[PDB]
Amino acid sequence: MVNVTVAYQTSAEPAKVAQADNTFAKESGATVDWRKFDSGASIVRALASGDVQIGNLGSSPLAVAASQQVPIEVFLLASKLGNSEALVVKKTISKPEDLIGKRIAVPFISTTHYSLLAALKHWGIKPGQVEIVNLQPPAIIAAWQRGDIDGAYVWAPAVNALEKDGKVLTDSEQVGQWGAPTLDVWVVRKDFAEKHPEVVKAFAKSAIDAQQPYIANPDVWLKQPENISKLARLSGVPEGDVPGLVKGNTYLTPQQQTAELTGPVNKAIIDTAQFLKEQGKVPAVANDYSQYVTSRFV
């Protein structure tokens, strides 16, 4: 009897179909407690305490966790982030220079915190010129509704909630093109991987299998109504928003998973940590994070 707690986040992406179908529990035989978390930083804390054994992290919280020597490994990429993550602002903010003096919310050290800082640097705006405030996405939505912030760099469901009456100023496809790409990954605690390697393998299988039909033909995948409804439910977004969100990232074949986990993810962590250090968010970083990545479960 295996019990495993999986920390998940709200991105609308094809592997949510396997989550809704309970495929991981069915194939692994484990009792799975799927726990929704509002951002990666809170997942890092739950991984470090042992309350969570498998967790979905943005690349920015991943780099923070690895720089603190949390005993976790990336064993699977979830997505390469594009415009599914975006900076949405009040409609009177028309140009990046209009961000000066404004109150912009991001969840602390999320991929969108990282991308906001990378976007400001690319634009030549110092982060001290913007009032950057840290709120979790439910609080961001509530503060936006009451007019207490001028914008936020967010993912679903906050990104589409804000965009209904706001404007997109930049997004993570653009910030990636400017040289600061972000990723979503799955990580596992070493002690869990040591005791239940076949359960970890079954998690990776369930996620990879769910994404391949989308990769093969996005438009055919998106017209299967149960694919849309399952993502709408788990992400908390209207069905009409799901296709745009799903198309806002790219996903990996099994060959691409093995390729990325054998070098590129390490390099991504190295660079992400270095930028976070330069922005004053992490005190110490390493020049190699190979301890934090593995291909052995795919």
Numbering used by the authors: 22 to 319
The authors write:
In E. coli, the ssuABC and tauABC gene products encode for an ABC transporter for the uptake of alkanesulfonates and taurine, respectively; TauA is the SBP that recognizes and binds taurine, TauBC is the ABC transporter that mediates the transport of taurine in an ATP-dependent manner. The SsuA and TauA proteins belong to the class II SBPs that are characterized by two globular domains, linked by a flexible linker, that form a cleft where the substrate binds. TauA is composed of two α/β-domains (domain I (23–104 and 202–319) and domain II (105–201)) connected by two-loop hinge regions (103–106 and 200–202) with the substrate-binding site located at the interface of the two domains; both domains are composed of five β-strands flanked by 11 and 4 α-helices, respectively. Although, SBPs are usually described as highly specific for their substrate, we show that TauA is capable of binding different taurine analogues and alkanesulfonates, including phosphonate analogues, with different affinities.
